Amino acid sequence: MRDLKTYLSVAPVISTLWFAALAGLLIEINRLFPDALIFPFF
Amino acid sequence: PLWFASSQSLSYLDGSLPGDYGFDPLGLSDPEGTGGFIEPRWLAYGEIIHGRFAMLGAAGAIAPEILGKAGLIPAETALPWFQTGVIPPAGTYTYWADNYTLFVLEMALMGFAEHRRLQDWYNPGSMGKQYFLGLEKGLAGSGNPAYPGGPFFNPLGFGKDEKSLKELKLKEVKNGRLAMLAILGYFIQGLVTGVGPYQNLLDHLADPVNNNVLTSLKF
Amino acid sequence: PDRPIWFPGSTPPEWLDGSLPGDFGFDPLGLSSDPDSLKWNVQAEIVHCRWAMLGAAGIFIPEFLTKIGILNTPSWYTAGEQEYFTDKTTLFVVELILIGWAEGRRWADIIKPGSVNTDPVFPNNKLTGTDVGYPGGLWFDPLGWGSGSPAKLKELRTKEIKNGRLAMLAVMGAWFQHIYTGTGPIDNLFAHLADPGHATIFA
Amino acid sequence: SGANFARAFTV
Amino acid sequence: EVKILVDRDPIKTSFEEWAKPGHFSRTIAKGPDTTTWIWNLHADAHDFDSHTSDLEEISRKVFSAHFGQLSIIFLWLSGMYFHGARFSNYEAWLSDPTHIGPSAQVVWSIVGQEILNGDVGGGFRGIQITSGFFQIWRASGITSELQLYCTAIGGLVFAALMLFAGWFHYHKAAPKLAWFQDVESMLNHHLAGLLGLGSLSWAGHQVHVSLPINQFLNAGVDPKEIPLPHEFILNRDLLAQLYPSFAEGATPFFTLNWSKYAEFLTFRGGLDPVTGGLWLTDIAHHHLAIAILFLIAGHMYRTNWGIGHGIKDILEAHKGPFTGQGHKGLYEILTTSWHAQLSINLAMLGSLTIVVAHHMYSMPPYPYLATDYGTQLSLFTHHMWIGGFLIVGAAAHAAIFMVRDYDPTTRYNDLLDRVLRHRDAIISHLNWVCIFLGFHSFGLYIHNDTMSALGRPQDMFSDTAIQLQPVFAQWIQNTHALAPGTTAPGATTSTSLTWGGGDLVAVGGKVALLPIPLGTADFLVHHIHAFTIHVTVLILLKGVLFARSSRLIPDKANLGFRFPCDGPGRGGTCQVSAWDHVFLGLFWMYNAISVVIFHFSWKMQSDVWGSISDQGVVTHITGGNFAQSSITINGWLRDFLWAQASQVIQSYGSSLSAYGLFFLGAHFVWAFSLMFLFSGRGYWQELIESIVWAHNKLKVAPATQPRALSIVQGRAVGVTHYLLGGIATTWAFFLARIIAVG
Numbered sequence A: 001m002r003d004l005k006t007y008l009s010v011a012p013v014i015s016t017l018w019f020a021a022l023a024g025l026l027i028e029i030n031r032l033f034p035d036a037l038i039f040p041f042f
Numbered sequence B: 001p002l003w004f005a006s007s008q009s010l011s012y013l014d015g016s017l018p019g020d021y022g023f024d025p026l027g028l029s030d031p032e033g034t035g036g037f038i039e040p041r042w043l044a045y046g047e048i049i050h051g052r053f054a055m056l057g058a059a060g061a062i063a064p065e066i067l068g069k070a071g072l073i074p075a076e077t078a079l080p081w082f083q084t085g086v087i088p089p090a091g092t093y094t095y096w097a098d099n100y101t102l103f104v105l106e107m108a109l110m111g112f113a114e115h116r117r118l119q120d121w122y123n124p125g126s127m128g129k130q131y132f133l134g135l136e137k138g139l140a141g142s143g144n145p146a147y148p149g150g151p152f153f154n155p156l157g158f159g160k161d162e163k164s165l166k167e168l169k170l171k172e173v174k175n176g177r178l179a180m181l182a183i184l185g186y187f188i189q190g191l192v193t194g195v196g197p198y199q200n201l202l203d204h205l206a207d208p209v210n211n212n213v214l215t216s217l218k219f
Numbered sequence C: 001p002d003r004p005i006w007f008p009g010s011t012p013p014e015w016l017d018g019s020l021p022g023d024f025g026f027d028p029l030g031l032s033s034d035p036d037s038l039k040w041n042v043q044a045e046i047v048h049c050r051w052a053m054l055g056a057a058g059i060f061i062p063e064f065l066t067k068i069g070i071l072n073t074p075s076w077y078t079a080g081e082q083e084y085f086t087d088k089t090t091l092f093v094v095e096l097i098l099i100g101w102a103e104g105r106r107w108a109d110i111i112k113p114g115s116v117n118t119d120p121v122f123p124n125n126k127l128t129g130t131d132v133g134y135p136g137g138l139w140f141d142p143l144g145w146g147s148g149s150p151a152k153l154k155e156l157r158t159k160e161i162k163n164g165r166l167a168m169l170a171v172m173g174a175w176f177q178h179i180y181t182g183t184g185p186i187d188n189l190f191a192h193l194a195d196p197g198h199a200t201i202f203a
Numbered sequence D: 001s002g003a004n005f006a007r008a009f010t011v
Numbered sequence E: 001e002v003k004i005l006v007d008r009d010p011i012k013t014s015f016e017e018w019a020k021p022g023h024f025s026r027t028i029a030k031g032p033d034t035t036t037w038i039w040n041l042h043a044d045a046h047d048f049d050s051h052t053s054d055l056e057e058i059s060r061k062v063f064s065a066h067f068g069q070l071s072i073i074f075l076w077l078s079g080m081y082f083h084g085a086r087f088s089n090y091e092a093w094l095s096d097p098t099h100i101g102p103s104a105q106v107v108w109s110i111v112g113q114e115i116l117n118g119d120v121g122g123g124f125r126g127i128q129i130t131s132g133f134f135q136i137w138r139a140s141g142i143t144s145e146l147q148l149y150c151t152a153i154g155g156l157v158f159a160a161l162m163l164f165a166g167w168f169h170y171h172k173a174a175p176k177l178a179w180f181q182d183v184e185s186m187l188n189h190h191l192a193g194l195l196g197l198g199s200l201s202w203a204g205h206q207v208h209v210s211l212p213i214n215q216f217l218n219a220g221v222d223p224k225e226i227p228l229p230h231e232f233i234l235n236r237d238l239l240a241q242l243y244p245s246f247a248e249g250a251t252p253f254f255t256l257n258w259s260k261y262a263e264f265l266t267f268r269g270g271l272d273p274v275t276g277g278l279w280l281t282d283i284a285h286h287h288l289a290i291a292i293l294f295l296i297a298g299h300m301y302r303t304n305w306g307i308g309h310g311i312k313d314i315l316e317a318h319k320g321p322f323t324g325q326g327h328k329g330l331y332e333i334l335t336t337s338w339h340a341q342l343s344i345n346l347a348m349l350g351s352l353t354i355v356v357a358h359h360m361y362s363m364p365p366y367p368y369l370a371t372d373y374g375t376q377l378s379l380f381t382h383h384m385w386i387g388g389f390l391i392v393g394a395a396a397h398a399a400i401f402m403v404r405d406y407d408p409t410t411r412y413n414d415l416l417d418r419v420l421r422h423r424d425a426i427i428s429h430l431n432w433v434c435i436f437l438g439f440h441s442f443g444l445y446i447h448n449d450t451m452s453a454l455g456r457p458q459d460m461f462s463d464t465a466i467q468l469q470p471v472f473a474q475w476i477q478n479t480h481a482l483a484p485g486t487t488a489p490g491a492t493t494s495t496s497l498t499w500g501g502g503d504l505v506a507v508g509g510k511v512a513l514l515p516i517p518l519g520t521a522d523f524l525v526h527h528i529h530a531f532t533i534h535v536t537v538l539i540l541l542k543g544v545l546f547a548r549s550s551r552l553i554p555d556k557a558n559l560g561f562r563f564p565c566d567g568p569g570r571g572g573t574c575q576v577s578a579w580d581h582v583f584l585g586l587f588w589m590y591n592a593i594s595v596v597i598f599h600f601s602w603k604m605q606s607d608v609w610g611s612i613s614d615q616g617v618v619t620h621i622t623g624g625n626f627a628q629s630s631i632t633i634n635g636w637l638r639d640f641l642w643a644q645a646s647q648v649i650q651s652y653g654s655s656l657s658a659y660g661l662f663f664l665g666a667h668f669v670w671a672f673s674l675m676f677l678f679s680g681r682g683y684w685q686e687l688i689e690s691i692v693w694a695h696n697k698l699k700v701a702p703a704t705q706p707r708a709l710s711i712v713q714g715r716a717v718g719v720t721h722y723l724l725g726g727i728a729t730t731w732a733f734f735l736a737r738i739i740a741v742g
């Protein structure tokens, strides 16, 4: 289990999980708010 | 007593096995480079198990037809071995439960038997240690995986003498080989003529010249 | 050492000595090789046992009673949909706060074994339990049955663990039966008992 | 053929 | 003799090795000091020959890698089948194939990309596919979706089985070395078992399942009313009504009066008028004949018994006029080194792929395939690119063998030594023929352009001023046209319609095939093809031959297979390794394949494809201007590149916008590649120095010191980007044009 965690801590795997999570967040934000050219909150 | 024995095969076949006739043209049981599921002991165990199961199946596939023809069983019960529901496209019969429920029940019971058998094969005397409602005492085994013996599997005390035991082992292996050949014949016949083997025997006895392999293939 | 195991004739893993309550040497995947992993898994299993046990009781008692004419409680699956005196989100938030306080206390106990055994408001109260996952004290052990000989304690813990495991399996079975078939679990049980041959999952 | 296209737009 | 030899548990499956990278090589395993380490860890990942020296470990690793590759292929096939089953309009296309475009991909509706869901037809929206899978499924007899689902599930199960087999054979039971080196049994099983039994079983399927279902489909019956395939097996009445011969059963075959089977095993040849494809009876007959031939030919080599032939005996005992002793030590060379086998197999596979592409465009083997222009273009281009790449790789592996696996002491070969001893004559003659061919072939075009620009159209090499006709090709075409009457009494018609003479075949108002004329332009283009092929051969052969040693560097073997140079001395010695020769030959292979595919596309669009009217006239796509406009470079630039790019660039705002986006992206990548191809390492290192100073000023310098890419890595990156950009440009252009106008 120690070496499994160590391998999952390697650079490519951590990078791909991080980028997948970020892409999912961006995709969900763009789906919830369809399109926007300016910041209208303030 | 050698049948098609080769120079390579005769080296490792020392005759210390029931029904050892030195026949091995392809050299599968060669004793160097053995691994996985290719080992002489495992092959012998498989041959014995196949012989036993084939004898059981050969008896059971031919009993109902004869019993029905003799009038000792109701007609609606006696069926050929492929109309019993094994092959639904060929035919089907009704039982007290659905086919798949019986399949699950048989799978559970046979798993309970066969996993214990496999664990016995792995570790010889392990299987008679843990509590199993008191039956484990009779399941210790004799140390030879092929013939566990014991009160449960040898209650009649047969084969006490070593010579009689060897003769009985030879009888068992020969009968197993015969039953395996019979089952293969059942399969091929049911594939070709589409009729139960007992009716094939009756037709052959009625008129051997007009009823054989050739007439069905015609020419 | 020579305790019964899940697979007779096999060798149990080296990290399951057998001192833990309700042990059978069942860990083929090696998910608890590290010690801290073992502690976390033990705590998670205990909490899951308790929660699933309460859930199984609260699912199978009212439904069976409603099979009789004693009560009229609706089905467990539609309980969330039925209306109440407040919107569901407010109840969720209040429950979140109330359970979050207790979960924070339990987590602080897990990280530091003996740091949350004192009542902060009135310091006269205390919790006498001396094991993680077994708080003890008057609030959680009023009858005092928790304290006793190590053998009896081990036996009681084994009974609790086995009941919890059975409860988890029963709850998951009830959920899957409801989604797959679409009827109350007691109805399925009666239908199966009437016709054990054909009234199966295959149907 | 309509159901296959609709499978993408279920949400 | 021949036997199974295995080793039990050579390696133990453990996660300990996964934790630390680079365990195969010690210098990698030490630890990272600079960034170069990272770039090395991927460069030697599959260099099994350099990790160790024992043949057993290399063979076992090769076996396991093969199993993994097979699992990946099976997963890909299962995915394709599941996509066909779930998100597709196959059932709509089955009833009306001519007016419905195949499509098996549906795009989500996230950002505004929903415009990619074009209206292919049949009440469906999705991306049109050009893989030709629908024709394969129709020819196989599939008429529903449950069958496709079952096939996908079976493919997934097979992938899982292959993965388990790979793990089991590497980590539990590993075959020994003597098992691998038994080539007689390997050849016997690969010929009799893999190629004979497989084709016989496929012939059985075609005879039993595909033929009746396809007959019912061609008869005009609705797909939902056709009986299921197993009903044909169970019921003899249906087969008897469809084919009376089946009423006799298997009796004729055992009686040697096979003419009774002439109903569904024919020899007509040609194209089927209804679907514009080969007769399925002919295909089944060909498969049966191939099965018989392969089963006969798979019993040639002696294995574990008295009968057979010995490969070593055949090689040693062959005495000829030109060879002599010749082939003596070739058996050890070909049974000891993996690289020689890899080179030969790669060359054979590349040639086979090219031949496959040619034969497949010549004679369409699937129903409703000829009239689909996009599918034909895509298949031809893809297969030819694959063949070119494989043929190129063969030379690189031959060079590897010559560098690191050749010693004249233990294993000596006479023919190889004789070839090596006179390399200068070979290279000189190849150089002369390349120069002469290129000079003539390109000078003809330059002369045509110059005489055109000066207003002298009567001094050209054209169809009207000075003629150069390919007389031999025309004679061959005439002989093939006249063959069916006299040379092939059995065949009712020609093998293919491409040969001159005969009749036009068209399906659903679209031309399927007609004779292809040959003139001056074909002459010039074929000579250009020969020139490019010769130059590529010269580059690769020089790289292979001069790998061990040269006049400039007498000890090039010690430096190795991959070394950038030897130094600034001797006038400069950059790019002398065989790796650089492969890197140089890649460009010329790309050039040749591009020219060939351009020729094929223009000729097919000009003189074969088109539309036919009720009256009978044929209007081609481009008006048949290839014969007069393709003899000048201006004609190729104006009438082909400029005219046919209108559909690619004017696709914005429509359902083909992705093609224009890829058209621009490929240009960007192609321009990007020159950055690596033109510059050098020292400038980049000196710039990284200042950048690193700027970093260190703010206490953010890493422990792994940045380093510029090595020379070989820079060249590899450049060539990779160049090839990718060019291929993507051609792909986008071809697909957009042929989908829009076809």
Ligand code: CLA
Residues within 6 Å of the ligand: E439, E440, E441, E442, E443, E444, E446, E447, E450, E459
């Ligand atoms: C590459 C080949 C090529 C060829 C074959 C031609 C051919 C032709 N050109 Mg073009 N041309 C070319 C490229 C070429 N051109 C290029 C690159 C340009 C620059 C743009 C031009 C520009 C051009 C112009 C401006 C003109 C021509 C014209 C002509 C004609 C004049 C030829 C001539 O008189 O000299 C032939 C001279 C010889 C001495 C022949 C030598 C070769 C002999 C036969 C070798 C045979 C060797 C032997 C058999 C080998 C074995 C020996 C053994 C027996 C011992 C001729 C038809 C002229 C014209 O208008 O014609 C209509 C003209 O005015 N050309």
Ligand code: CLA
Residues within 6 Å of the ligand: E042, E043, E044, E045, E046, E047, E048, E346, E389, E390, E392, E393, E394, E396, E397, E400, E562, E579, E582, E720
């Ligand atoms: C049939 C299969 C085949 C096989 C098994 C091999 C086997 C071998 N090759 Mg050979 N080779 C082949 C075909 C094959 N080759 C072909 C067709 C060519 C012509 C290009 C070559 C040319 C070649 C060269 C030039 C070299 C080898 C070498 C090697 C060895 C090292 C492999 C390596 O380290 O890569 C590990 C993996 C990588 C570096 C992957 C690189 C990434 C590729 C290039 C990108 C492709 C881009 C992708 C498709 C685009 C998608 C874009 C998206 C990702 C954004 C290995 C034994 C090397 C050697 O030193 O041998 C000892 C070497 O120098 N090969």
Ligand code: CLA
Residues within 6 Å of the ligand: E668, E671, E672, E673, E674, E675, E678, E679, E687
């Ligand atoms: C059109 C192609 C091209 C491009 C794009 C570049 C780009 C650049 N040049 Mg190069 N160059 C080229 C051709 C090209 N060159 C040629 C032909 C030569 C002659 C040999 C040179 C010689 C040269 C010199 C001498 C120098 C540069 C330098 C630079 C940089 C200048 C700063 C800047 O523009 O950053 C803008 C950055 C970008 C446009 C880069 C692209 C960003 C990509 C697209 C983003 C990644 C996104 C996406 C997720 C990719 C994923 C990949 C996939 C596998 C997953 C920049 C990297 C100068 C330098 O290094 O400055 C620091 C410098 O010293 N160049």
Ligand SMILES: CC(/C=C/C=C(C)/C=C/[C@@]12O[C@]1(C)C[C@@H](O)CC2(C)C)=C\C=C\C=C(C)\C=C\C=C(C)\C=C\[C@@]12O[C@]1(C)C[C@@H](O)CC2(C)C
Residues within 6 Å of the ligand: B023, B024, B025, B026, B027, B028, B050, B053, B054, B056, B057, B058, B060, B061, B081, B082, B084, B086, B180, B181, B183, B184
């Ligand atoms: C176990 C077996 C069959 C078992 C059947 C059973 C239980 C049937 C049960 C049922 O019927 C009932 C009761 C009732 C039905 O309602 C249902 C079913 C279920 C149908 C057959 C084995 C059948 C096994 C067979 C036929 C094996 C043949 C092997 C051969 C010929 C090997 C030859 C060689 O291996 C040698 C010996 C040496 C080498 O050197 C060379 C070669 C040539 C390789």
Ligand SMILES: CC(=C/C=C\C=C(C)\C=C\C=C(C)\C=C\[C@@]12O[C@]1(C)C[C@@H](O)CC2(C)C)/C=C/C=C(C)/C=C/[C@@]12O[C@]1(C)C[C@@H](O)CC2(C)C
Residues within 6 Å of the ligand: C026, C027, C028, C029, C030, C031, C048, C049, C051, C052, C054, C055, C056, C058, C059, C076, C077, C079, C168, C169, C171, C172
């Ligand atoms: C906590 C829990 C678990 C269930 C169910 C939990 C299940 C099924 C867990 C299964 C775990 C398995 C199988 C693990 C296996 C292994 O990990 C081992 C052990 C060892 C490894 O070596 C090998 C593998 C295989 C990895 C369930 C809790 C349920 C609750 C509170 C239900 C509450 C409610 O009903 C009420 C009261 C009233 C209703 O109106 C509302 C709800 C909300 C519906």
Ligand code: SF4
Residues within 6 Å of the ligand: E564, E565, E566, E567, E568, E572, E573, E574, E575, E711
């Ligand atoms: S360092 Fe560069 S320029 Fe100098 S010889 Fe080597 S490759 Fe050529």
